[PDB]
From Swiss-Prot, chains A, B:
YjeF N-terminal domain sequence ranges: 10-220
Gene that this polypeptide is encoded by: Naxe
Recorded superkingdom: Eukaryota
Parent sequence residues shown: 50 to 282 of 282
GO cellular component, one term: extracellular space
Name this polypeptide is given: NAD(P)H-hydrate epimerase
Species: Mus musculus (Mouse)
Binding site for K(+): 65, 130, 166
């Protein structure tokens, strides 16, 4: 049975990865983003969708979860989805400026505003990716994300969350928060994951050294062959 | 029919990727390395091998092909191979120091010398990955790579080459050079690829924007589902 990580633990593992093992931030994010794009394509394959190419809104927050979202948007386009991104708060750091340019030149469009009504999102986007807040959230949630989350909580189309459903307390969840259909837990699941009631839970981020998985007793499942995702439960 | 690129063309496409599209070097290398690890696992799956875990020597050169090799070693270990690396000439740049530490802490060992006789390599390593020179080679080939290539040309176990078989002229090949069993062409094949006579030719590096594939008329095949490799011919 895979370990579900405290916020303490998750912070520690993440910090080993960057300092002790010296993975660069972009390397880990590229693998995370790919895992996400991959989970989405397995859960919601293109052939199984009414639109062709199937359309997807990726909503990216102001830190690393946002960046996973950018990577994810990009691999989705390659897997034959048609993504659109909303990215309202963009850290001005080469990592993020690069990701934005990549998507831009992939003709992945960045909206200037969130569609203000649940219905409009529903009509335009067959699936929505919540790439807003991640495991290091505390929060608490400022604008424009409060009003964004609030639009999301009224959607009828599925939500895919990266790592944590944004708006949820990282260990305790949130009974009134958003309720996604797919959760991609990166590295290993966080304790908020026990409150998850969607259909698809996937593990992603196939880059965890054995020595580290042992040290924290993560008990990761065996990813099949060369896959970067594993369907849990 | 996929385009086979001149060295001119390949240099140009590569430079669009980094300048115009602003992919960072590590992002592209992580995807390349993964493609390689993946081609190897599909061509030589673990179950199909006499040793368990199956063993692999990754020989890494002094530039980017070397770095793809480091990434590749690492994903191989994750896919259940047991790799060993020989990396004699290491650029002292954070990118490469990071890759070395990652592998080190994965318990992937870096040999201090090349086993000097073809037979010793054969007895220890079921497969050898040629991660030495890449598409920007001119060369010409200095030590210790000359004596290395020379050891390789006497092997009985298969060779997997990344992008180009090292020692070959990038467009014209090399009749007396090494003769690999697997070639992983990254991005798109180079003209040396027409001289390839091994069994496995895979395309890798699933990150080519449509606008760029169109501008250079690469005519890439369709990668299946969420795969990062495609078997050619
Ligand atoms: C440990 C860790 C690293 N990176 C993530 O995105 N999530 C995690 O839980
Ligand atoms: C265009 C190009 C980029 N990167 C590579 O490794 N090989 C290539 O041919």
């Amino acid at each position: 049975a895979v370990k579900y990580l405290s916020q303490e633990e998750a912070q520690a593992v993440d910090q080993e990865l960057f300092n002790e093992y010296q993975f660069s931030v972009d390397q880990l994010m590229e693998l995370a983003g790919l895992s996400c794009a991959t989970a989405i394509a397995k859960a919601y394959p293109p052939t199984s969708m009414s639109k062709s190419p199937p359309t997807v809104l990726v909503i990216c927050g102001p830190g690393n979860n946002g960046g996973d979202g950018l990577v994810c948007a990009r691999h989705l386009k390659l897997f034959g989805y048609q993504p659109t991104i909303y990215y309202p708060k963009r850290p001005n750091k080469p990592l993020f400026t690069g990701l934005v340019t990549q998507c831009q030149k992939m003709d992945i469009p960045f909206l200037g505003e969130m569609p203000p009504e649940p219905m409009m999102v529903d009509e335009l986007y067959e699936l929505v990716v919540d790439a807003i807040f991640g495991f290091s959230f505390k929060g608490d949630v400022r604008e424009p994300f409060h009003s964004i989350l609030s639009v999301l909580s009224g959607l009828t189309v599925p939500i895919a969350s990266i790592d944590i459903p944004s708006g949820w307390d990282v260990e305790k969840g949130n009974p009134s928060g958003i309720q996604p259909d797919l959760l991609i837990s990166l590295t290993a699941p966080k304790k908020s994951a026990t409150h998850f009631t969607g259909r698809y839970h996937y593990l992603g981020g196939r880059f965890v050294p054995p020595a580290l998985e042992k040290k924290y007793q993560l008990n990761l499942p065996s990813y099949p062959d060369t896959e970067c995702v594993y369907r849990l439960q």
